Design an enzyme around this catalytic site. Structure first.
Site, mmCIF file in Angstrom:
data_model
loop_
_atom_site.group_PDB
_atom_site.id
_atom_site.type_symbol
_atom_site.label_atom_id
_atom_site.label_comp_id
_atom_site.label_asym_id
_atom_site.label_seq_id
_atom_site.Cartn_x
_atom_site.Cartn_y
_atom_site.Cartn_z
ATOM 1 N N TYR A 58 -41.911 -59.657 28.154
ATOM 2 C CA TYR A 58 -40.927 -59.790 27.102
ATOM 3 C C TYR A 58 -39.677 -58.976 27.411
ATOM 4 O O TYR A 58 -39.769 -57.771 27.680
ATOM 5 C CB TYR A 58 -41.490 -59.328 25.761
ATOM 6 N N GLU A 113 -33.017 -63.090 23.979
ATOM 7 C CA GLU A 113 -34.349 -62.762 24.473
ATOM 8 C C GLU A 113 -34.928 -63.777 25.435
ATOM 9 O O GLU A 113 -34.725 -64.975 25.305
ATOM 10 C CB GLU A 113 -35.337 -62.461 23.340
#
Ligand SMILES: Nc1nc2c(ncn2[C@@H]2O[C@H](COP(=O)(O)OP(=O)(O)O)[C@@H](O)[C@H]2O)c(=O)[nH]1
Ligand SMILES: Nc1nc2c(ncn2[C@@H]2O[C@H](COP(=O)(O)OP(=O)(O)O)[C@@H](O)[C@H]2O)c(=O)[nH]1
Ligand SMILES: [Mn+2]
Ligand SMILES: [Mn+2]
Lengths: 288, 373, 378, 288
Positions: free
Chosen positions: B101, B188
């Protein structure tokens, strides 16, 4: 009062614009000491009797200035705030809405390191009741009295002050700190100032969803405040992940929830009004 | 402003983030042709502005062109938590060894952009924010210097990411350049993927743009209309209003975001259920209120309208005049409850005599009224 | 690396600097066609890597397509202080009200980029700075924050430029973004012009790129060969050598820029006249010296070659071996004088017996030898 | 000596590279204390007995380090210097040639503000005769003696030191400060250090065309130096506007002329050698 009073000498940036010129007139009627104006391209001109300069530096070379209020359009507004800080102006009031967040992330950092205090952006300004008006708020709702105000909103603030004024409590300095996510001055920045102003007997914090300035302000009050503080939170029923008008009024998952703000006020012994009238009621109570 | 995965990927690719080749499809036939062109396994991904597309069944792998056709067919037009899928991305499937992530958001307490990095990719990063807040490593970026390779490498080691260190760090650097480059509020990569061949790739991407900065990104400003969560957001913008669609049936109009939130809070507290947020801005003259009514009434769900305004200097009939105009043009077909503080509140009342537009002196009162509608 | 005006303009335009529309022409025919397409008064400008093109007659106005043809014809192939014009820019002529100077260079004393701004445009800035330095205003730019509009506006007022203040400042801001954007070492707009209509335009532009940053501008790295002041600069780069063409007939090869400058200074002092600067880098093994010889000898002006090397650790025979290889391939047709300090210098001498390659223990001695010799193929 | 001696513990960044490998071996032969190496991607490897880490921070977590020498390729070298300074390494020697000027304009500013001393880039490094070698210079030409050296070049420096050594004068610390236009350490930065080193009885300044570090050094010597200084200028016959090999060896109109440098030495009572031998001769003379 804090920060500004009748002696505060004011520069207006963006004075020739329709907003700047409208509010310059209003401020002049109120008694604010507007001594100079700045608009690049319009130096040598005059607005409502106020001389206009191309740059802040020229302006302060001909006039002593303690504060600047900025009405420059969003794409240029951050740059205008930088210019004022670099000219040595101690207090900068940035009214303009719609400034890119990253412009402010950059500018707030630079302006603070230079020693200027920035209020805004996306804010109604600052008023010291019956002393001086540096902003866009209606002067008539601010009777001089006993209560200091710090708010993330505009019109809502005016309603509270009108109520406080009608109840004979009155106000000292009201500061609209803005509806943006990145601002120059938070609740916690102004609280110590109010705390040490004997004319301020109580402080009302008008907050709303988003970020955690309210929680940080509450923690400070708990440990440091020597006078009553009363809170209010707009957007208690708001959905998550949606901007509610103000760029900064948004709940991002775990951050900025109304519940967190209510909880932090309680733990600090700060009573939370549910309505405008309850603000007046809670302040009356705390003041005997 | 929300962007679709394929738009986010275009931006990331432009800044040097590796991205699986992909193309958008509006029909099963286009999906098939695309699968044929790639000539390998592909993924069919719903392009909608929510997350959890995977759990909701909007992300299907397809080994052949005929499977791509069938998986597109099953996804196009499907419902994913409220949204209807009108397009899909057809991308080459990557062979995944690791899912990480990487995310950038504004940290409002630090007034700085923060990089959030974690080994636990492919999963709700908020979930990890509880199970184990310790599994998320943070770096607050210098707003003038930016995010440099050496800082990126340290973050990679800090988070214990396995894979090529230099390539991982480069992705992180490019991610931030893209963030600043398009004035993102959020960027992201989830999952940031290490392939079985050791390659680094952004298998998914999310970008949300700062609306205040659209003026300096024309190519992206164009997408405003189509990316809107609701068509009324655009109309309202025309007048300088901020509109938000909520689920409910009481229409709301106010002057000031703070006051409007307060109004929503009042309504909700007394049993009501607001249909929208609408901030008409600081001022409230006749034209403004008329336009606001115009916008709010284009919403089928609206039973009636609660107008809550504090004018102070602005005269109250200004509001009434605008509501009247709307009514006598046959626009206003629902009941309208108002609280209008300001000058000459009485002459404003003797403007609305007999007409289906009722004033009150208090906001809570007006709020209650609209509940019985 | 030097860029032509038209290349500098393309870069400036890309960053938002206003620029007169223009197009490059290689023939009078192309100049005429271009004039026709613009359908107004144009300027024909020699594209060469020097300044003073105007005084030298490489910048001519043309009111009609036929004049554009004629003037292109008069300029193409002309000589401007040493250089041959191989192309011209055909640009729309601007009507000029004001000529200002704006330039960015590295100020090495402050270790920062400095903006230089002056009312006195259209004139050799170097003159100005020497004559009346007070007419030049300076701003040293923050290497991380950059150059912001408010700083640009202050500079405009400081320098007393007349014209739209915001548009002047924007050009200055874009000029710097361009500078950083292509890793320029120099970017100037001279003259920065206010037109009779009040418009702001870059009537001329100069950009010099940082060679150390070409690796991150592929676009521009491509132009390296064509923009080279001399074709040997490119060859020498292949081996990692730095070459500079000088006017003279003694070829120079050394290991270390400092040592090579010293060598040039020695030669010049004793009456000689060096044909080139060539730094072969830190080390000096056989292959390196051979390639260096190869490069230097491709220069017709070279009458002989002075090799001056200080190896220390590196063997001296390494140099001799490389020179021998060159001689034994019929590459080395001129006399070669060497000073090679290091190990086993005697073993190296023995190697150069019967070869027109002579060593000396001292540099000044070797230097004198080459100055006096009539060179030429042996 | 100054800056480094036999106790200096050295980290090599770029140790696995061709150049790093080669010079690590040379330094080890000389006696330099190489304790660790850094190359992202090769952590856990070993080179000539030296453990290799991915980052400088890992390296200094397992080894005490007083200085770092950088052999990283030009596109990544500035970033490597930043990494070292951010890891708290006090002395950083940047060897690599070809680093973009603007990379250095940025990095030099940041590294200095952090408290690290940067030498380079485009430099041969630093050597303290018979104590430690942190660079690419041949150790055999530096006999330990009485003379300190600061140079903008490499091989030319080695020749001067060889001459000073054969004349029985010898050398203390020699610092190659680099051939770039923007460098971490100038003549004037090192002069106070030599001034206060009793083992250094004389200082030789080997300079060249470009910029004005020589003139600034000369001015400082005039006012503060308590021992003899001898100068030398490469490129006295150089043309204008042309880089002579070194990125920094260029005369830009009025700036960086050889004449200006000779004039400033003269005014400071700094004798200028015209040849290597004259360097030895002028130093002998000044030392009684
Ligand atoms: N093997 C493989 N899996 C993928 C690929 N793309 C997505 N996935 C998987 O499907 C899941 C959902 O896809 P994603 O684009 O992240 O959708 P999201 O649910 O909105 O976050 C991801 O977490 C991946 O593990 C691919 O190209 N190859
Ligand atoms: N009227 C007019 N003059 C020009 C134009 N372009 C250049 N000049 C003039 O020609 C002179 C030199 O040309 P320039 O483009 O600067 O090339 P330079 O010779 O290398 O300096 C300048 O001083 C300008 O005043 C144009 O379009 N119109
Ligand atoms: Mn995902
Ligand atoms: Mn010119």
């Amino acid at each position: 009062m804090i920060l500004v009073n009748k002696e505060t000498r004011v520069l207006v940036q963006g004075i020739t614009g329709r907003e700047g010129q409208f509010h310059t007139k209003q401020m002049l009627s109120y008694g604010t000491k507007i001594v100079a104006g700045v608009t690049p391209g319009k130096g040598g001109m005059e607005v409502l009797g106020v001389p206009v300069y191309d740059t802040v530096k020229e302006a302060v070379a001909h006039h002593e200035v303690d504060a600047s209020i900025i009405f420059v359009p969003a794409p240029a507004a951050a740059d205008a705030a930088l210019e004022a800080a670099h000219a040595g102006i101690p207090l900068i009031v940035l009214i303009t809405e719609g400034i890119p967040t990253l412009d402010m992330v950059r500018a707030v950092e630079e302006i603070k390191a230079l020693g200027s205090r920035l209020i805004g952006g996306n804010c109604p300004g600052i008023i010291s009741a019956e002393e001086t008006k540096i902003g866009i708020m209606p002067g008539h709702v601010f009777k001089r009295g006993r209560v200091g105000i710090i708010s993330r909103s505009g019109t809502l603030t005016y309603e509270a002050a009108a109520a406080l004024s009608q109840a004979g409590l009155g106000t000292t300095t009201t500061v609209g700190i803005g509806g943006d996510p990145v601002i120059g001055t938070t609740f916690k920045d102004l609280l110590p100032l109010f705390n040490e102003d004997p004319e301020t007997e109580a402080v009302v914090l008008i907050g709303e969803i988003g970020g955690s300035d309210e929680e940080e302000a509450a923690a400070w009050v708990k440990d440091h405040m020597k006078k009553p503080v009363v809170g209010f939170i707009g957007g208690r029923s708001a959905p998550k992940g949606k901007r509610m008008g103000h760029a900064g009024a948004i709940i991002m998952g775990n951050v900025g929830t109304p519940e967190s703000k209510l909880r932090a006020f309680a733990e600090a012994g700060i009573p939370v009004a549910d309505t405008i009238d309850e603000i007046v009621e809670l302040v009356k109570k705390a003041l005997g | 402003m929300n962007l679709h995965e394929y738009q986010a990927k275009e931006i990331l690719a432009r800044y040097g983030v590796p991205v699986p080749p992909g193309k958008v499809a509006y029909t099963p036939e286009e999906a098939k042709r695309i699968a044929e062109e790639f000539g390998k396994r592909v993924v069919i991904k719903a392009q909608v502005h929510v997350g959890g597309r995977g759990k909701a069944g909007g992300v299907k792998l397809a080994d052949t062109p005929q499977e791509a056709y069938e998986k597109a067919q099953a996804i196009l037009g499907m419902n994913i938590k409220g949204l209807t899928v009108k397009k899909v991305l057809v991308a080459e499937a990557v062979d995944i060894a690791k899912e990480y992530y990487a995310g950038l958001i504004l940290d409002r307490a630090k007034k700085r952009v923060v990089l959030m990095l974690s080994k636990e990719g492919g999963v709700d990063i908020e979930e990890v924010a509880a199970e184990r807040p310790e599994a998320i490593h943070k770096f607050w970026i210098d707003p003038h210097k930016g995010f440099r390779p050496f800082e990126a490498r340290e973050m990679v080691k800090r988070a214990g990411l396995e894979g090529n260190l230099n390539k991982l760090a480069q992705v992180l650097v490019a991610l931030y350049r893209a963030y600043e480059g398009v004035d993102a509020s959020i960027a992201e990569i989830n999952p940031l993927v290490v392939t079985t061949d050791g390659g680094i790739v952004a298998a998914d991407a999310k970008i949300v743009l700062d609306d205040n900065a659209l003026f300096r990104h024309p190519d992206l400003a164009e997408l405003r209309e189509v990316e809107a969560e609701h068509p009324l957001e655009v109309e309202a913008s025309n007048y300088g209003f901020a509109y938000v669609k909520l689920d409910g049936n009481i229409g709301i109009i106010g002057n000031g975001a703070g006051l409007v939130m307060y109004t929503l809070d009042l309504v909700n507290r007394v049993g009501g259920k607001p249909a929208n947020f609408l901030d008409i801005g600081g001022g409230a003259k006749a034209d403004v209120v008329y336009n606001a009514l115009k916008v709010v009434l284009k919403d089928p769900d609206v039973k009636g309208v609660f107008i809550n305004i504090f004018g102070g200097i602005t005269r109250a009939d200004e509001v009434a005049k605008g509501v009247i105009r709307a009514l006598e043009e046959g626009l206003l077909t629902k009941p309208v409850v108002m609280r209008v503080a300001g000058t000459a509140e009485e002459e404003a009342k003797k403007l609305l005599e007999g007409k289906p537009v009722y004033m009150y002196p208090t906001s809570i009162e007006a709020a209650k009224v609209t509940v019985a509608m």
